[PDB]
Design brief:
Chain B: Belongs to the universal ribosomal protein uL13 family. This is part of a larger assembly, with 9 protein chains of 9 kinds. Helix content of chain B is 36%, strand content 0%. By secondary structure, chain B is mostly helical. Chain C is mostly helical. Chain C has 2 helices and no strands. The N and C termini of chain C lie far apart (40 Å). Classes of the chains: A alpha+beta, B mainly alpha, C mainly alpha, D little secondary structure, E alpha+beta, F mainly alpha, G alpha+beta, H mainly alpha, I mainly beta. The interface between E and H is small, with 6 and 6 residues. Chain D binds 3 RNA strands through strand 1 and helix 2.
Chain lengths: 146, 197, 27, 125, 151, 33, 170, 51, 106
RNA sequence: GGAAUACUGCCAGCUGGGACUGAGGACUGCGACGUAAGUCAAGGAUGCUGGCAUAAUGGUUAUAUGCCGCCCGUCUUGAAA
RNA sequence: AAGCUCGUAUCAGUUUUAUGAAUGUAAGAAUGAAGAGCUUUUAGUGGGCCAUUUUUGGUAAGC
RNA sequence: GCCCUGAAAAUGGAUGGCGCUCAAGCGUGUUACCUAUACUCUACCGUCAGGGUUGAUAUGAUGCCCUGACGAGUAGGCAGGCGUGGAGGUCAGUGACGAAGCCUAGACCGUAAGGUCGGGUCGAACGGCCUCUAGUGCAGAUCUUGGUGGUAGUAGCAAGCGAAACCACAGCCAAGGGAACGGGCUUGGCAGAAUCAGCGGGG
């Protein structure tokens, strides 16, 4: 699993990313279950994620977003020209998704504002833990980790 | 608040009582506990009478005299109890059990001055009604304390000489509660009430 | 009287008894 | 100067381990080298060892409380190089310069406007 | 300004903070009774008159009541009590910041006292006990927990 | 030099996305059906 | 805390098998997802299926019909323990379907050490007429004009030092 | 560089015709005296003897 | 006449700690009568003075002071966090600290 | 039959209280507001005021309290020894 | 460590589909990485113990 | 399910202590709070990577910048410095108006190696910079020599005179500290300066 976490770019703990979901990845998320908390984002959260913790890879260099022209330049190749254009490509898993995702630098997320809820972080959510698929609930979490 | 909070065991639970009496010194709080002997506990008698002797045996080998000294007198019984949750040994500690004082009975100068209790620790109010519960007095005695009586007797005295007191007071008030009553209802008053008083 | 402290040789000599009960059940 | 507020980072002296117990072992810092040593392994409670993070803010480095860089002046020619940097350097008269010579370095520095870090050196009234 | 810079100091960046006028907390409406929390006149009841150009408040006791002159004071070092007086009879526009420079009491300053005070006393005399209320000192009494307290 | 964040600071939330002026004159979060 | 979830599932429609059987069950859970997770677990105990082989058709909450009325609740419960599993029935006088199963779960913990993973709730039903009530501690309140006291009332103090010496009448 | 750094030198040197400002308002009843450590004996070990 | 008190009388409990490692920068203060975090919010950011006599006279008064701010709450009891200029001495654990009423929000 | 109201979720809704921070150093940039002139919360703090020279303040050492801290080196062995 | 070619489509403790008797070969499959390969040489290294998971032999057990 | 029984001795004894009983115990649920060198953010240090910068920049292009990431470490590798004796060169260097050395409850600097200054003692030579060179940097080696302690005014001479062996450091119990390891640790019991005479008691 350690290998796999690296392939998602989930390096340090409390780091977060998006993933295109097919047959392939839905088997990966199975492997990394005990190590992650994954779920289905709203339009809203992304929007909150990207204006505050949204950063851009440019040759290397984690660049802060904070002006559209940046994305207009580096991603104008793929018909993305604003930040909301970027968001549009994340939420609706678009034809240039692999690129817009990869252009976004894997989110840095402060431990949750209110705490995790549970006493014990490492059980499957379903039995009063944190790890694995928490579907819609993820949005309550990420917004405390924003 | 108050500089000295003369407490009063009379129906408390050696533990609990303690604890709090404890914290309170640690947080700089001159206490003073009275009627130790009327302190209580939990459980039958023929227990505390164990959970003790055992304690008794203890003592030192090669030299019995140098070791866990088994105090009898209530006061102390309860002391311990407490000097047991206060890092005693360290300035801040000593600096406490410095602030403490635990008499059996209720000798002057405290006789003459209001006492009080510590909810969060009365038999009545914690022990599931009707359950075995020991009462120092016996429990001391049973194992050395030679006075239960003196206290006792040289007690009854106090109670007396007081109640007596009381009266004189109850008599007094009454008068007030009467004056105020009558000279109550005239303007001035009224007004107050409006505000509330 | 008996004690209620678990000495660590026992506290971990329980785990190493419990592990032996795991491999016993399988066979 | 309207200098930045000078952060000192670590004000205590970096003493050597055990320089307190033995009179032979000295207060001059030396790394510990035995692999059974706790200092070398930085266990809790044990003495702080000099690492590179304690390094001072490059803007404020060398700057003394006055907010001047120290600078040693031997004679009255050497002083007059700071003719242009009175706001930045402080003429430390050097320790061996005599009495009779000093009184002359003080004449100029007062006139030029150089803040001497060590006046009243050897000198009386 | 004529003297060319003998030393090389770099000039500041063009700083972007305009000074905006201070917005006072709701409770302060000119002609309010206040408690002073700090100063020579800590613990006094004192009347609010005018907010100022230096973000302070101009206040008098008045002086004939509790011995508080015409004074400036800071916004935070005051508790605003609900009791409001009539203040509209008072001319206050004479005093601004410059009224308070120093480069034994000035005979000019004492003349402005009595103009204000006599134009004020009148309005305090309307309400019962207020002349007495002002002359007294505010304090906390045992059992006054000031998170509970209403002012 | 410093990361001004949208969400808070309106002014940056107008440099990113000019639409949000239009999103606020129509209320848009508060929409009736 | 609990909510009741009406769930239906149908093992994804294959070729020549269009629209299968649809399995309706009312699940008490804390959230929609625990609910779903529980749903498949019960599916694996009724017959041979898996979570990937089927699909959650429709999962909808159910609110209690009249939650200003006091009903009596006859509950069937299968539960596992140290031994092999065994069927049960208890009774609960309550307000709501949901608060009933809730208060049952506390009792199932308190008496039999069994946790939420173990317990299947079989069927909860209101009992309309009395005399169908088979348990004494329920029948105990089904008497005309039940007037009783709560003696020995603990008054919880905030302050540590009380001067009155507290009396407990009611 | 020069064009300016000269203007600069010029100034500081001119604003050091402020020696006259030290030398008119002189008349200072102080003047530095050297302490030679021979003297700081003959005038320390001879008092102990006088006393 | 009896009172000149314009402050709330709290006690200095500890340094914020763990089981093991105390940081002496964060002094824990109990205040009088305050029971909740809610009641405490009021006191947040008022100036505290710890006051004490010393041996020697300094400015015509034997009576020295330290100053500091309530910064945030601590647990539920209303125990509150507090930072001073120079830290408070530890030898003063369980001593009285005068908590004031400026700066007002009220 | 008719409303509500909780619960879940949203707001590029409004209005407060507290702590920490102020990096950088002529101007360029992206903007916003204004009819324009301009102004601004827009590529990182400015403004006002108070305290001093028998200062202000800062330090050294001796202890005190709280909390932490097994005796350094070498040599084995799987580390403790 | 230096040199040479590249700077890439060079690969990966990863999943998938495809094709045979947990496991082999391919992808115009996914995700991740601008850190790869070819010369030439140059230090240090040959300690086990514990736990996990498959078994293999095991009687009072342990193992 | 909980409870008693469901055997274990022998220096006093441990849910860690005190203590706890509608718990401070057991089962479960809900919230609130406490805190790590973990995570977030800002500053700072350094390193790496990417760059800007000349008809020359209001500072040595071996400068002065801009952006971003990163920071455990033994053997081992690579690099930048700090110090000592002597050599060449230089500062028309310092210096009896006190060189060097030595102290110092003194000041400043530098992450540090170290460098600087004041005060005191002192008495004749010495320092920075650029390069050279080497008998060049100490905590240990039952190190070598020299000097001095405790032991001790003790054993001792078959009131005076007067050693040596030895010496990391101290020496209270009880329990726990997994590894025939308890002496410093954890939890307790406790503990009042100062000293003489026994046992033949343990290590």
């Amino acid at each position: 699993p350690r290998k796999v976490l690296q392939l998602l770019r989930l390096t340090r703990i409390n780091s977060g990313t998006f993933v295109k979901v097919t047959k392939a990845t839905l088997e990966l998320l199975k492997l990394i279950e005990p190590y992650v908390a994954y779920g289905y984002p709203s339009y809203s959260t992304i929007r909150q994620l990207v204006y505050k913790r949204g950063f851009g890879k440019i040759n290397k260099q984690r660049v802060p977003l904070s002006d559209n022209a940046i994305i207009e330049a580096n991603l104008g190749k793929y018909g993305i020209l604003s930040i909301d254009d970027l968001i549009h490509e994340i939420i609706t898993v678009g034809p240039h998704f692999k690129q817009a995702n990869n252009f976004l630098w894997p989110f840095k997320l402060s431990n949750p504002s209110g705490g995790w809820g549970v006493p014990r972080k490492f059980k499957h959510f379903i039995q009063g833990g944190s790890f694995g698929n928490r579907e819609e609930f993820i949005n309550k979490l990420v917004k405390s980790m924003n | 608040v108050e500089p000295v909070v003369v407490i009063d065991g009379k129906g408390h639970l050696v533990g609990r009582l303690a604890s709090v009496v404890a914290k309170q010194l640690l947080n700089g709080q001159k206490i003073v506990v009275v009627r130790a002997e009327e302190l209580n506990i939990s459980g039958e008698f023929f227990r505390n009478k164990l959970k003790y002797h055992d304690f008794l045996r203890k003592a030192t080998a090669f030299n019995k005299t140098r070791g866990p000294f088994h105090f009898r007198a209530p006061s102390r019984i309860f002391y311990k109890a407490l000097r047991g949750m206060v890092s005693h040994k360290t300035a801040r500690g000593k600096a406490a059990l410095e602030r403490l004082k635990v008499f059996e009975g209720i000798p002057p100068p405290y006789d003459k001055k209001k006492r009080v209790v510590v909810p969060q620790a009365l038999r009545v109010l914690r022990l599931k009604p009707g359950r075995k519960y020991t009462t120092l007095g016996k429990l001391s005695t049973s194992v050395g304390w030679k006075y239960e009586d003196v206290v006792a007797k040289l007690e009854a005295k106090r109670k007396v000489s007081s109640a007596e007191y009381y009266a004189k007071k109850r008599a007094f008030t009454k008068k007030v509660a009467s004056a105020n009553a009558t000279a109550a209802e005239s303007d001035v008053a009224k007004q107050l009430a409006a505000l509330g008083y | 009287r008996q004690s209620r402290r678990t000495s660590t040789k026992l506290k971990e000599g329980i785990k190493k008894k419990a592990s032996a009960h795991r491999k016993k059940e399988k066979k | 100067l309207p200098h930045p507020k000078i952060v000192k980072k670590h004000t205590k002296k970096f003493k050597r381990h055990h320089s307190d117990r033995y009179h032979r072992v000295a207060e001059n810092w030396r790394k510990q080298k035995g692999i059974d040593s706790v200092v070398r392994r930085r266990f809790r409670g044990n003495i702080s060892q000099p690492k590179i993070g304690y390094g001072s803010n490059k803007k404020t480095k060398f700057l003394s409380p006055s907010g001047h860089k120290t600078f040693l002046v031997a004679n009255v020619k050497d002083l007059e190089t700071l003719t242009m940097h009175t706001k930045t350097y402080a003429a430390e008269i050097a320790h061996n310069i005599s009495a009779k010579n000093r009184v002359v370095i003080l004449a100029r520095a007062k006139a030029l406007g150089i803040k001497v870090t060590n006046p009243k050196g050897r000198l009386a009234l | 300004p004529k003297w060319y810079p003998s030393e090389d100091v770099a000039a500041l960046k063009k700083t972007r903070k305009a000074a905006r006028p201070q917005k006072l907390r709701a409770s302060l409406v000119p002609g309010t009774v206040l408690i002073l929390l700090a100063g020579r006149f800590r613990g006094k009841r004192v009347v609010y008159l005018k907010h100022l150009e230096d973000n302070t408040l101009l206040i008098s006791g008045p002086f004939k009541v509790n011995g508080v002159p015409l004074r400036r004071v800071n916004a935070r070092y005051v508790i605003a009590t609900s009791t409001k007086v009539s203040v509209e009879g008072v001319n206050v526009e004479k005093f601004n910041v410059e009224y308070f420079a120093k480069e034994e009491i000035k005979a000019e300053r004492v003349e402005d006292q009595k103009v204000v005070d006599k134009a004020l006393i009148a309005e305090i005399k309307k309400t019962p006990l207020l002349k007495q209320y002002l002359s007294a000192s505010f304090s906390l009494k045992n059992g006054d927990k000031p998170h509970m307290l209403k002012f | 030099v410093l990361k001004k964040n949208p969400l808070k600071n309106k002014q940056v939330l107008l440099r990113l996305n000019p639409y949000a002026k239009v999103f606020a004159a129509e209320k848009l979060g508060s929409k009736k059906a | 805390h609990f909510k009741e979830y009406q769930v239906i599932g149908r093992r994804l429609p294959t070729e020549s098998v269009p629209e299968p059987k649809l399995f309706r069950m009312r699940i008490f859970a804390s959230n929609e997802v625990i609910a779903k997770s529980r749903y498949w677990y019960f599916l694996q105990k009724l017959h041979k299926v898996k979570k990937a082989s089927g699909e959650i058709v429709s999962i909808n909450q159910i609110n209690e019909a009249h939650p200003t009325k006091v009903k009596n609740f006859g509950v069937w419960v299968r539960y596992d323990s140290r031994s092999g599993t065994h069927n049960m029935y208890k009774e609960i006088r309550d307000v709501s379907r949901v608060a009933a199963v809730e208060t049952l779960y506390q009792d199932m913990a308190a008496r039999h050490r069994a946790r939420f993973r173990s317990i299947h709730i079989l069927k909860v039903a209101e009992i309309e007429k009395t005399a169908d009530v088979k348990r004494q501690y329920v029948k105990q309140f089904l008497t005309k004009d039940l007037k009783f006291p709560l003696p020995h009332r603990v008054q919880k103090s905030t302050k540590t030092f009380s001067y009155k010496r507290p009396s407990t009448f009611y | 560089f020069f064009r300016h750094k000269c203007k600069q030198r010029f100034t500081k040197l001119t604003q050091v015709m402020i020696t006259e400002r030290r030398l008119a308002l002189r008349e200072e009843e102080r003047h530095y005296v050297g302490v030679a450590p021979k003297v700081k004996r003959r005038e320390q070990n001879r008092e102990r003897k006088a006393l | 006449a009896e009172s000149h008190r314009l402050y709330v009388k709290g006690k200095h409990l500890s340094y914020q700690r763990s089981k093991r490692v105390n940081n002496p920068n964060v002094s824990l203060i109990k205040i009088e009568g305050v029971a909740t975090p809610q009641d405490a919010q009021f006191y947040l950011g008022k100036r505290i003075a710890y006051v004490y006599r010393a041996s020697k006279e300094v400015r015509g008064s034997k009576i020295r002071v330290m100053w500091g701010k309530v910064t945030r709450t601590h647990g539920n009891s209303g125990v509150v966090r507090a930072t001073f200029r120079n830290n408070l001495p530890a030898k003063t654990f369980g001593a009285s600290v005068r908590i004031f009423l400026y700066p007002s929000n009220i």
